[PDB]
Amino acid sequence: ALWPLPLSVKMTPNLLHLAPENFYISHSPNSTAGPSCTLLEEAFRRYHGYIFGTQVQQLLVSITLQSECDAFPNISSDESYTLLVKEPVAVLKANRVWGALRGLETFSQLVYQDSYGTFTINESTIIDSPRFSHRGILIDTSRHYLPVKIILKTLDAMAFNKFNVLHWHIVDDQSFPYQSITFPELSNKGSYSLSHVYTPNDVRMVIEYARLRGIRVLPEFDTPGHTLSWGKGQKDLLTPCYSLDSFGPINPTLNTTYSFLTTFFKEISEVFPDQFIHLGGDEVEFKCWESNPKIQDFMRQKGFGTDFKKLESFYIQKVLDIIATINKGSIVWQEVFDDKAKLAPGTIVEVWKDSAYPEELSRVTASGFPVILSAPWYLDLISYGQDWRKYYKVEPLDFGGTQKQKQLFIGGEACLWGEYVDATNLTPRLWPRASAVGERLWSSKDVRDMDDAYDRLTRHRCRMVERGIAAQPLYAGYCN
Amino acid sequence: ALWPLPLSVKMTPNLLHLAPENFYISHSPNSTAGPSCTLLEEAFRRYHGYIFGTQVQQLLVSITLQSECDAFPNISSDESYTLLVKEPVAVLKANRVWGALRGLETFSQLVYQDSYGTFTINESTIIDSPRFSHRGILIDTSRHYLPVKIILKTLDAMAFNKFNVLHWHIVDDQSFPYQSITFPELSNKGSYSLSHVYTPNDVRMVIEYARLRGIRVLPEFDTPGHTLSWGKGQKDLLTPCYSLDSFGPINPTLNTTYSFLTTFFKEISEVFPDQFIHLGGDEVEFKCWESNPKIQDFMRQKGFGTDFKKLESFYIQKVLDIIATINKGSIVWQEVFDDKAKLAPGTIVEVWKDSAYPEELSRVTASGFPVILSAPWYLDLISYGQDWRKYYKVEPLDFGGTQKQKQLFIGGEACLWGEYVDATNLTPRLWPRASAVGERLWSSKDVRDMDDAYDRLTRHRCRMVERGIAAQPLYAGYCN
Ligand SMILES: *[C@@H]1O[C@H](CO)[C@@H](O[C@@H]2O[C@H](CO)[C@@H](O)[C@H](O)[C@H]2NC(C)=O)[C@H](O)[C@H]1NC(C)=O
Ligand SMILES: *[C@@H]1O[C@H](CO)[C@@H](O[C@@H]2O[C@H](CO)[C@@H](O)[C@H](O)[C@H]2NC(C)=O)[C@H](O)[C@H]1NC(C)=O
Ligand SMILES: CC(=O)N[C@H]1NC[C@H](CO)[C@H](O)[C@@H]1O
Numbered sequence: 001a002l003w004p005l006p007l008s009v010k011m012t013p014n015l016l017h018l019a020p021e022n023f024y025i026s027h028s029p030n031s032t033a034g035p036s037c038t039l040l041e042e043a044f045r046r047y048h049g050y051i052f053g054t055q056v057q058q059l060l061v062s063i064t065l066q067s068e069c070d071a072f073p074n075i076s077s078d079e080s081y082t083l084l085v086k087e088p089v090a091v092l093k094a095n096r097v098w099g100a101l102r103g104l105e106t107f108s109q110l111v112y113q114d115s116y117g118t119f120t121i122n123e124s125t126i127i128d129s130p131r132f133s134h135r136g137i138l139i140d141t142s143r144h145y146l147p148v149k150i151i152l153k154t155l156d157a158m159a160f161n162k163f164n165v166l167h168w169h170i171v172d173d174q175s176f177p178y179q180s181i182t183f184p185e186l187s188n189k190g191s192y193s194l195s196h197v198y199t200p201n202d203v204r205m206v207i208e209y210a211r212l213r214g215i216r217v218l219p220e221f222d223t224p225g226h227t228l229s230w231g232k233g234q235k236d237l238l239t240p241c242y243s244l245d246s247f248g249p250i251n252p253t254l255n256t257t258y259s260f261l262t263t264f265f266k267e268i269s270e271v272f273p274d275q276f277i278h279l280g281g282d283e284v285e286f287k288c289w290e291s292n293p294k295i296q297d298f299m300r301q302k303g304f305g306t307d308f309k310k311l312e313s314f315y316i317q318k319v320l321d322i323i324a325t326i327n328k329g330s331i332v333w334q335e336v337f338d339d340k341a342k343l344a345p346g347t348i349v350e351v352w353k354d355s356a357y358p359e360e361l362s363r364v365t366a367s368g369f370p371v372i373l374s375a376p377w378y379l380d381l382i383s384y385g386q387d388w389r390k391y392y393k394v395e396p397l398d399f400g401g402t403q404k405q406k407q408l409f410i411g412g413e414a415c416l417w418g419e420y421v422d423a424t425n426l427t428p429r430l431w432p433r434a435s436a437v438g439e440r441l442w443s444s445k446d447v448r449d450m451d452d453a454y455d456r457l458t459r460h461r462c463r464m465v466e467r468g469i470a471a472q473p474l475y476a477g478y479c480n
Numbered sequence: 481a482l483w484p485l486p487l488s489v490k491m492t493p494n495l496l497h498l499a500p501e502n503f504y505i506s507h508s509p510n511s512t513a514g515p516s517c518t519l520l521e522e523a524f525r526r527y528h529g530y531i532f533g534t535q536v537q538q539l540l541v542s543i544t545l546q547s548e549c550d551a552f553p554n555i556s557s558d559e560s561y562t563l564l565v566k567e568p569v570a571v572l573k574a575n576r577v578w579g580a581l582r583g584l585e586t587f588s589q590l591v592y593q594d595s596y597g598t599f600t601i602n603e604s605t606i607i608d609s610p611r612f613s614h615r616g617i618l619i620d621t622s623r624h625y626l627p628v629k630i631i632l633k634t635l636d637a638m639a640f641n642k643f644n645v646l647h648w649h650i651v652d653d654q655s656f657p658y659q660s661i662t663f664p665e666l667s668n669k670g671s672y673s674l675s676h677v678y679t680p681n682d683v684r685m686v687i688e689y690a691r692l693r694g695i696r697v698l699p700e701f702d703t704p705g706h707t708l709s710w711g712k713g714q715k716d717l718l719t720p721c722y723s724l725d726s727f728g729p730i731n732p733t734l735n736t737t738y739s740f741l742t743t744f745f746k747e748i749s750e751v752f753p754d755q756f757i758h759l760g761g762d763e764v765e766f767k768c769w770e771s772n773p774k775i776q777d778f779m780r781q782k783g784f785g786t787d788f789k790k791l792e793s794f795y796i797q798k799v800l801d802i803i804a805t806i807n808k809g810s811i812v813w814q815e816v817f818d819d820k821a822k823l824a825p826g827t828i829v830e831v832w833k834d835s836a837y838p839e840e841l842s843r844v845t846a847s848g849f850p851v852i853l854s855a856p857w858y859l860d861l862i863s864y865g866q867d868w869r870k871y872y873k874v875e876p877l878d879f880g881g882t883q884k885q886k887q888l889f890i891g892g893e894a895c896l897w898g899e900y901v902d903a904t905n906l907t908p909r910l911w912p913r914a915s916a917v918g919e920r921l922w923s924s925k926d927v928r929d930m931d932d933a934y935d936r937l938t939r940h941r942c943r944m945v946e947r948g949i950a951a952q953p954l955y956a957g958y959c960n
């Protein structure tokens with residue numbers, strides 16, 4: 001009942017037992033980590049609880065290289081491990097802490113209770129490492145505020161599924177819950193209410209809780225579109241519309257805009273330790289810019305004519321430069337690439353439009369840019385039946401291109417946009433549909449047997465329910 | 481913020497206040513009901529909690545006719561009431577207890593807290609009665625078992641929405657959780673497990689909890705198809721298949737079948753006090769009957785040829801006769817009608833197939849039968865976005881027919897089939913999508929303004945959340 005299915009699993013028929021109050025998870029004497037390693041100590045304790053809730057007496061955890069116990073994970077973090085289940089001492093070996101975390105999850109999925117309640121595990125050898133290094137979940141806390149507790153629950157479910165990136169789409173048009181220290185008015189005026197806000201301490205808590213599970217927190221502060229809430233607190237930032245709505249995208253002709261964004265993103269570079277910041281750039285509406293006389297004047301001032309993609313490009317290039325100056329990397333939705341913005345090498349492009357996405361993947365990678373796929377995994381787009389199968393059947397590298405282009409494909413994300421999602425329905429909608437994407441992103445390309453996937457996923461889903469994650473059914477049946 | 485919108489609402493600008501520990505709901509001196517009326521006493525207490533959780537000091541409740549306080553509701557129950565909100569004593573007047581229950585819900589929807597927390601209500605006069613008398617929710621406890629507590633929660637949400645029928649699709653192919661007293665093996669062998677069973681006391685609890693809210697419990701024991709679980713405990717009931725699956729529909733050639741069904745339905749007539757029993761009759765598969773030599777012999781014995789609709793008709797007519805003999809009424813899915821079964825006058829037909837349903841409604845009613853519509857309200861068939869609007873826009877009487885035929889349309893049901901639904905996701909999936917159907921079935925035909933519906937429904941949904949029903953969002957926003 002392994003999910004995702006490990007790269008290599010070899011088992012024997014020899015059954016071994018475990019005794020809950022005489023089973024300890026501890027550091028191997030040769031490990032680079034010890035009791036000082038909070039991340040491993042906390043993992044040992046919570047996995048002991050998950051496991052239980054001829055005798056294998058102990059699980060020894062050996063970290064081989066500098067452990068990275070006090071660091072934040074990044075795109076290059078080594079999540080490989082091996083697990084040797086035998087008596088009297090099983091061994092989990094990993095280059096780094098990140099792999100040991102993954103291996104503790106796998107170990108917990110191997111232990112089961114027989115018909116008489118006896119805790120049991122098969123002698124086995126597992127070798128495992130992920131197919132892709134970027135394995136994300138997008139949550140949207142603007143369309144609806146999500147209490148910190150459900151973000152923490154989502155992070156727990158992510159760990160059970162070996163997801164390693166929380167793409168936090170923190171702000172958008174409808175609300176601005178991010179409490180900024182340098183700009184207090186953004187949240188004071190842009191939040192749904194003063195109790196629908198993420199304080200600096202809420203953000204640190206999420207980041208740290210994520211870190212303890214090997215999960216990166218990727219912040220998205222989408223501009224120049226998707227910024228209506230920003231205008232409440234930052235005066236003169238948005239373009240006033242002459243006519244359809246009242247305010248449009250951020251005004252890219254003003255120096256106060258770039259001055260504001262410089263101070264703002266500098267704060268973000270300090271709050272969020274991840275190497276990458278997602279700058280957004282999706283669905284920018286030009287009508288408001290088109291209808292504005294001052295923008296029209298700016299357009300002719302540098303020969304952009306009536307091509308507002310050049311103005312969007314001009315804007316996004318200035319933001320990308322601000323990010324590079326503060327030594328962070330940038331991620332961008334595909335529109336930025338499609339509208340001909342000049343992107344510096346290393347800029348990641350997230351391909352989200354479902355129309356000819358394989359052809360988009362070829363173009364991005366042929367231009368030399370790293371790419372992330374979310375297009376066929378828009379989990380907010382619900383439908384009747386077993387749609388997990390359609391997410392599962394995606395083979396992300398089925399696009400035209402050389403091996404060099406295929407090496408630029410670094411992973412993907414399951415996206416849960418928030419228009420129709422809040423605390424009442426997030427979890428059942430997310431899980432186990434996102435588990436399908438999790439396996440496609442972790443396991444080998446040839447892991448695609450549908451019957452076996454259904455068998456393992458129904459049990460994995462029951463395991464999620466047992467651990468307090470209200471994952472919905474795949475089909476008729478029951479748990480226990 | 482009324483939902484469903486009452487027939488007639490007239491308000492003044494005069495605001496009146498309420499004091500939580502000096503506001504009592506009590507029986508008017510002329511009422512036919514008093515302290516002995518458990519149904520009203522319990523309603524007074526729970527509505528006091530819902531309300532609070534120049535002064536109107538008291539809400540007097542006057543029942544005009546024999547109250548029916550100790551009875552079960554039926555299709556003809558009078559749910560009309562008037563509500564006069566004034567100082568110092570507001571008055572709720574109703575012919576029967578059923579209307580007072582509806583009026584207590586409406587009264588609770590009129591009370592609100594101003595910006596300073598002051599409990600407030602407008603002086604007003606409401607006259608109200610339902611457009612249709614059958615307003616149902618179908619739950620499916622076979623595809624997944626539902627704990628009694630979530631059935632009780634569903635009944636609470638039903639009351640908030642003025643639904644009055646719980647269509648309990650209790651058994652089906654996948655499991656038989658109904659614990660039968662006369663046939664203990666049905667559940668012992670057919671349930672998912674022994675802890676996934678509705679005991680006689682569970683069933684009484686549901687029925688009584690429903691009664692206290694003016695809700696009828698309509699049991700469905702679907703035959704001859706949808707009976708795989710029945711065969712585990714009742715040997716020789718199902719037809720053995722020669723070849724696609726193992727067992728097919730109930731065997732209608734054996735006297736042991738009708739003997740079993742006679743004893744079985746007699747027990748059902750005693751357990752479920754509602755006048756109607758839903759006999760099902762949907763999706764009967766003939767291949768198994770076609771492949772069976774003994775059935776083939778029976779087919780030629782009375783000249784049915786190769787027309788298995790005649791065998792289905794023969795079977796269903798014998799069951800309908802068993803129900804009539806025990807003095808209950810029958811409800812049947814449309815297939816029974818479409819396949820030319822001879823139905824006695826009074827048999828209700830439930831139109832569920834989405835293909836040309838208006839033409840089905842004309843045929844059924846032209847044949848003189850009462851009809852219930854569920855076709856466009858299959859809430860298990862989820863999709864992206866505001867699908868509440870499509871359920872809301874249905875005008876059920878838009879079919880061809882005379883006024884006599886239109887008087888045979890007695891109501892409808894929102895159906896939540898269970899293939900993909902259990903305790904983890906039932907409530908958010910059900911509510912507030914079912915609220916759309918609730919208004920269409922309660923309120924006037926001309927109540928269709930979409931903007932006003934969205935305004936009242938987002939607030940009604942927030943009210944459901946406040947009362948512990950985890951109803952999902954309609955769109956971006958927040959509650960409180
Ligand atoms: C883990 O160990 C068990 C017990 O040996 C394996 O189970 C059985 O396999 C044997 C022979 O392969 C059969 O004779 C038994 O009927 C199986 N079950 C029982 C009750 O012992 C199981 O296959 C092992 N897991 C794997 C995948 O290697
Ligand atoms: C219930 O009473 C209130 C208070 O009188 C009504 O509210 C206002 O309507 C008056 C005139 O119609 C306006 O001057 C106010 O601006 C409104 N609000 C406030 C703050 O008083 C309300 O309309 C009444 N409800 C209905 C539908 O009759
Ligand atoms: C990058 C992106 O996806 N932008 C938007 N596109 C549609 C989504 C709903 O499916 C959300 O509205 C989201 O904000």
Ligand SMILES: CC(=O)N[C@H]1NC[C@H](CO)[C@H](O)[C@@H]1O
Pocket residue numbers: 762763813832858860861897
């Ligand atoms: C009357 C009826 O609806 N029969 C079936 N039809 C399809 C449903 C799923 O949408 C359920 O399987 C249900 O049992």
